[PDB]
Design an enzyme around this catalytic site. Structure first.
Site, PDB file in Angstrom:
ATOM      1  N   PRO B   1      76.077  62.017 -84.733  1.00 28.84           N
ATOM      2  CA  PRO B   1      76.450  62.528 -83.396  1.00 28.84           C
ATOM      3  C   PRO B   1      77.833  62.034 -82.982  1.00 28.84           C
ATOM      4  O   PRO B   1      78.382  61.108 -83.580  1.00 28.84           O
ATOM      5  CB  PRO B   1      75.381  62.053 -82.426  1.00 28.84           C
ATOM      6  CG  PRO B   1      74.854  60.816 -83.133  1.00 28.84           C
ATOM      7  CD  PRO B   1      74.867  61.184 -84.624  1.00 28.84           C
ATOM      8  N   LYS B  32      69.400  58.337 -84.338  1.00 29.61           N
ATOM      9  CA  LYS B  32      70.186  58.480 -85.558  1.00 29.61           C
ATOM     10  C   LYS B  32      70.898  57.182 -85.925  1.00 29.61           C
ATOM     11  O   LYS B  32      71.212  56.369 -85.059  1.00 29.61           O
ATOM     12  CB  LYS B  32      71.201  59.617 -85.406  1.00 29.61           C
ATOM     13  CG  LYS B  32      70.546  60.974 -85.222  1.00 29.61           C
ATOM     14  CD  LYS B  32      71.483  62.107 -85.586  1.00 29.61           C
ATOM     15  CE  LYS B  32      70.737  63.430 -85.615  1.00 29.61           C
ATOM     16  NZ  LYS B  32      71.560  64.518 -86.204  1.00 29.61           N
ATOM     17  N   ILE B  64      73.571  67.109 -84.564  1.00 29.45           N
ATOM     18  CA  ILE B  64      72.846  68.081 -85.374  1.00 29.45           C
ATOM     19  C   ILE B  64      71.405  67.799 -84.967  1.00 29.45           C
ATOM     20  O   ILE B  64      70.813  66.813 -85.405  1.00 29.45           O
ATOM     21  CB  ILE B  64      73.008  67.837 -86.903  1.00 29.45           C
ATOM     22  CG1 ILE B  64      74.413  68.233 -87.368  1.00 29.45           C
ATOM     23  CG2 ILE B  64      71.992  68.679 -87.674  1.00 29.45           C
ATOM     24  CD1 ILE B  64      75.515  67.447 -86.738  1.00 29.45           C
ATOM     25  N   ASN B  97      78.738  67.975 -71.488  1.00 31.44           N
ATOM     26  CA  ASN B  97      78.338  69.197 -72.170  1.00 31.44           C
ATOM     27  C   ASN B  97      77.677  68.804 -73.479  1.00 31.44           C
ATOM     28  O   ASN B  97      78.220  67.997 -74.234  1.00 31.44           O
ATOM     29  CB  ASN B  97      79.562  70.072 -72.434  1.00 31.44           C
ATOM     30  CG  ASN B  97      80.049  70.783 -71.185  1.00 31.44           C
ATOM     31  OD1 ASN B  97      81.196  71.226 -71.117  1.00 31.44           O
ATOM     32  ND2 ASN B  97      79.172  70.907 -70.193  1.00 31.44           N
TER      33      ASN B  97
HETATM   34 CL   LIG Z   1      74.576  64.363 -85.965  1.00 37.64          CL
END
Ligand SMILES: [Cl-]
Ligand SMILES: [Cl-]
Ligand SMILES: [Cl-]
Ligand SMILES: [Cl-]
Ligand SMILES: [Cl-]
Ligand SMILES: [Cl-]
Ligand SMILES: [Cl-]
Ligand SMILES: [Cl-]
Ligand SMILES: [Cl-]
Ligand SMILES: [Cl-]
Ligand SMILES: [Cl-]
Ligand SMILES: [Cl-]
EC number: 5.3.2.1
Lengths: 114, 114, 114
Positions: B1, B32, B64, B97
């Site tokens: 991220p 993550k 993701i 966002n």
């Molecule tokens: Cl990611």
């Protein structure tokens, strides 16, 4: 198309001509006239990758088409190579987000490409 | 991220270890590995929120997966809390966002995550 | 909504009140209250358009709704006109990317608009 690179590498380390090199290289990679390619480099950024402050880069490539699974894996090699040689950035400390834009959502010259 | 924050707050107002705190907090919130978490802070920006130039921030979180209605509300509470506590930015003058990226559109180390 | 403009034009070339005009003009254009409009101007950037370092700009407009074919053309004429008149940037050296955001993907005030 549009390519943006944000990095913690200092401005003095970004070679003059890096923008033109990217422009020419991306024109070939995307098969578009260099006139349509815009490049933006943002040095001296306060950033971290994996909790480390070693040289790194957060980039993005926006284009109307010419984006996809195969093409993207190809661009990553091209761009990591350029960032590695010209900016001394390790390839595993580079992120490149790809965006396939609709012509209707890209403004230019008082209108959009739609 | 990847988490990016653009703010008009002065660089000096950014406490030491802030990048590390963001990295650590996001590792926990997103679940993550911190090894692949990138953080970017951009102070002293020329911006306005509601036409006012008081402290404010425009942020983005790309990941993701791990993006959704409930999760985003939780991230917003966490991140706005961090911005208010560490940068003295009121939560009502912060926009974040969120982007759920397809693995094929995230380039890293000469390829993509697909 | 949120409007961001990155340009190589020097900070001293941005006229006083530019952020206010953008806030006011965008509120009118999008039909949203100016209180909800955020603007961000980033001058003195290292960028090129078509391999030329002449005045140029890379912008983005994010909004929950109020984005589409005809609307984007209208925003582009409005925005390119302003950049041309206030910043002396040729409209054909400006790119504006438009993003229609899902309310659930926009954080604000410790939560999301979802
Ligand atoms: Cl990611
Ligand atoms: Cl394009
Ligand atoms: Cl040089
Ligand atoms: Cl492809
Ligand atoms: Cl699009
Ligand atoms: Cl056009
Ligand atoms: Cl995506
Ligand atoms: Cl909005
Ligand atoms: Cl101003
Ligand atoms: Cl429309
Ligand atoms: Cl319209
Ligand atoms: Cl969205």
């Amino acid at each position: 198309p549009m390519f943006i690179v944000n990095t913690n590498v200092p401005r003095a380390s970004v070679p003059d001509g890096f923008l033109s090199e990217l422009t020419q290289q991306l024109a070939q990679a995307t098969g578009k006239p260099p006139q349509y390619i815009a490049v933006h480099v943002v040095p001296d950024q306060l950033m971290a990758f994996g909790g480390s402050s070693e040289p790194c880069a957060l980039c993005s490539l926006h284009s109307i088409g010419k984006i996809g699974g195969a093409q993207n894996r190809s661009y990553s090699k091209l761009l990591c190579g350029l960032l590695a040689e010209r900016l001394r950035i390790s390839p595993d400390r580079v992120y490149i987000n790809y965006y396939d834009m609709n012509a209707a959502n890209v403004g230019w010259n008082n209108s959009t490409f739609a």
